[PDB]
Amino acid sequence: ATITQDTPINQIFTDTALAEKMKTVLGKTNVTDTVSQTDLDQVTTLQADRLGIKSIDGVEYLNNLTQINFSNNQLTDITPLKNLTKLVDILMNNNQIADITPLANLTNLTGLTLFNNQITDIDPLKNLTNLNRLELSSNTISDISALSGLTSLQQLSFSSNQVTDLKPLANLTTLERLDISSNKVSDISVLAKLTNLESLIATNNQISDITPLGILTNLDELSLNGNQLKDIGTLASLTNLTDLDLANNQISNLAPLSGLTKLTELKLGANQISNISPLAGLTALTNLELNENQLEDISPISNLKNLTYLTLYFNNISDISPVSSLTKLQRLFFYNNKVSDVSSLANLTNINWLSAGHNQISDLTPLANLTRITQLGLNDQAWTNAPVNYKANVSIPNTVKNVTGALIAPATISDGGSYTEPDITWNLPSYTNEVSYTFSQPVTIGKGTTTFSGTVTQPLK
Amino acid sequence: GPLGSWVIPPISCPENEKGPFPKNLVQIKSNKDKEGKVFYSITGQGADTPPVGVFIIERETGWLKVTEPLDRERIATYTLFSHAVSSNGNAVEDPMEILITVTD
Ligand SMILES: [Ca+2]
Ligand SMILES: [Cl-]
Numbered sequence: 001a002t003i004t005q006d007t008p009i010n011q012i013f014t015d016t017a018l019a020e021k022m023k024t025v026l027g028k029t030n031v032t033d034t035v036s037q038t039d040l041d042q043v044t045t046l047q048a049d050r051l052g053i054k055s056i057d058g059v060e061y062l063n064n065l066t067q068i069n070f071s072n073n074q075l076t077d078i079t080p081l082k083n084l085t086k087l088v089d090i091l092m093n094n095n096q097i098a099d100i101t102p103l104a105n106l107t108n109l110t111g112l113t114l115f116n117n118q119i120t121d122i123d124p125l126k127n128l129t130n131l132n133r134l135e136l137s138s139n140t141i142s143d144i145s146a147l148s149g150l151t152s153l154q155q156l157s158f159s160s161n162q163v164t165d166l167k168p169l170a171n172l173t174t175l176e177r178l179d180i181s182s183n184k185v186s187d188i189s190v191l192a193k194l195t196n197l198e199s200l201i202a203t204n205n206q207i208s209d210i211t212p213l214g215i216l217t218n219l220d221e222l223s224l225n226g227n228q229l230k231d232i233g234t235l236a237s238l239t240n241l242t243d244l245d246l247a248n249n250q251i252s253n254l255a256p257l258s259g260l261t262k263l264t265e266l267k268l269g270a271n272q273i274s275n276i277s278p279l280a281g282l283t284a285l286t287n288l289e290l291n292e293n294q295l296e297d298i299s300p301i302s303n304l305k306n307l308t309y310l311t312l313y314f315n316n317i318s319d320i321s322p323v324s325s326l327t328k329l330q331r332l333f334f335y336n337n338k339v340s341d342v343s344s345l346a347n348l349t350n351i352n353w354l355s356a357g358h359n360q361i362s363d364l365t366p367l368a369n370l371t372r373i374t375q376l377g378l379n380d381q382a383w384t385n386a387p388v389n390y391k392a393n394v395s396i397p398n399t400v401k402n403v404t405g406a407l408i409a410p411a412t413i414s415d416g417g418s419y420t421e422p423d424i425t426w427n428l429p430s431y432t433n434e435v436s437y438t439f440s441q442p443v444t445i446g447k448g449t450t451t452f453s454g455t456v457t458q459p460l461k
Numbered sequence: 462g463p464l465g466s467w468v469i470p471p472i473s474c475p476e477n478e479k480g481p482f483p484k485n486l487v488q489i490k491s492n493k494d495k496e497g498k499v500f501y502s503i504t505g506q507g508a509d510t511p512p513v514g515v516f517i518i519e520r521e522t523g524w525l526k527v528t529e530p531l532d533r534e535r536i537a538t539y540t541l542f543s544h545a546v547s548s549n550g551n552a553v554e555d556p557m558e559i560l561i562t563v564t565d
Contacts, residue, residue, distance in 0.1 A: 050513055071529070072514050093482075093528065094514060115483065115528075135481045157481035160519075179481055182522075201485065204522060223485070226522070247488075287470060309470050313492065333468055335492060355464060375464040450462040 001060045001083060006034035013058035017051045056080050078102045093135065100124045114139065115157065122146045144168045166190045181205065188212045210234045224249065225267065232256050247289065254278040269311060276300045291333065298322050320344060334359065335377065342366055354448065364403040364452060367445055376448025387459035395425040396458055400439050410437040434459050465554040466492030473562035476533040483517060483526035490523055491545040493553040505541030516541060516561065533563045
């Protein structure tokens with residue numbers, strides 16, 4: 001397809017956005033200045049992303065195009081691409097593209113980027129055997145049969161579609177980087193064929209069995225976040241792993257992890273773990289996430305001298321002191337535990353994020369010199385004192401101490417009681433099983449600001 | 462405070478990464494997800510303003526993804542903000558400023 005005679009740009013390129021670009025691309029002052037076929041022949045690459053383009057009518061005349069970026073447009077029809085057989089690379093993500101038949105014969109393509117469209121039928125991909133990179137996330141694909149001869153593929157995504165059946169991957173032994181996340185995938189048996197896999201991302205699926213991964217010894221990154229994993233015995237064979245994400249599963253036994261000493265990120269939050277002794281030789285960790293488990297003794301963690309990021313929120317932790325070993329911590333999370341003495345945190349010079357809400361913390365003085373904090377949390381503490389004897393005029397000391405070392409005055413005090421530093425004093429006519437008080441005090445340490453708040457219960461005998 | 466229930470790892474992405482895209486950087490998390498569903502979004506340059514959509518976030522799961530390779534001698538850094546809402550449209554958190562460093 002070719003123009004004969006000099007022709008206004010705005011009559012080849014009917015799109016306002018695109019004639020504007022092609023005006024510049026071809027080097028012309030006005031969208032009405034004419035161009036000939038030879039002018040058009042010299043355009044071999046085009047970067048027309050993010051220009052609000054609604055049509056690519058006219059791109060057919062750029063017969064020598066090898067590489068195009070029309071990502072982030074409003075394209076639907078892509079029919080002007082049909083005969084551009086010299087195309088090797090297409091980036092066309094984030095359009096409203098439904099029909100990809102116009103791609104069917106673009107046989108020389110090695111890179112094809114189609115994520116965020118509304119594609120269902122990928123049968124037009126079948127003959128594109130030179131493809132080594134293909135991206136199809138965030139479309140509405142149920143059937144991948146059309147990938148079966150794409151035996152040059154190295155990089156492949158179709159995250160967030162509705163593909164259950166991975167059988168059509170069986171012969172793509174060249175694959176190295178695969179993402180199958182958010183599909184309805186239960187059975188990954190076919191992945192056992194993919195011996196060259198270095199990266200596998202399979203988050204938010206319904207995978208309970210990982211024995212297919214066993215011979216996949218070249219994997220260095222695996223993400224199985226949000227599955228139904230429990231037995232991970234298989235992972236002990238993947239000694240090349242450096243990045244392992246297993247959060248949101250049902251995992252309790254971590255011994256298969258012990259020898260995976262090249263790991264620098266491990267995620268294991270929202271599992272069923274009480275024992276982290278298998279973790280102690282993983283000294284190369286920088287990120288460890290252990291939130292939402294069943295932890296109490298976190299002493300194995302003191303070994304992990306390199307960590308800069310640690311999550312521990314929603315466990316059953318009393319003794320925070322192993323973390324004080326971890327001199328290079330920049331972000332620490334332990335909301336919703338049972339920590340009281342925070343004084344071992346004193347030796348965390350590098351801490352920026354300290355997230356310590358809903359624990360049993362009465363005294364902030366040991367955090368005074370943590371002046372690189374830019375994000376802080378300390379609200380909704382609680383504790384119950386050991387009981388004391390009921391007297392009509394019973395009194396207890398306020399123990400709540402701010403970062404300055406001054407006591408924080410109670411916000412409220414049950415049973416009509418009242419305060420004179422340091423003491424809270426009730427005037428109680430008949431036996432009552434318990435009295436209480438609250439506090440609530442805005443505080444900033446360095447540049448991190450929180451409300452330090454709590455409820456203290458006092459049982460009476 | 463601004464922390465609220467935010468839980469977010471530091472973000473730095475190598476330039477010239479290989480596909481496939483999008484590629485997960487970190488999962489952004491509000492611990493208010495314990496009271497009910499939280500819905501996640503991002504704003505900033507690289508997000509909703511030019512260059513638009515270099516970064517995206519999955520709105521159920523909080524997965525923050527880069528959608529293309531980066532080049533360090535073009536933009537070496539990016540500043541975004543995260544956002545957490547309930548089904549009701551209500552902020553459950555104060556938007557958090559996020560630094561994304563492009564690395565070697
Ligand atoms: Ca969680
Ligand atoms: Cl998690």
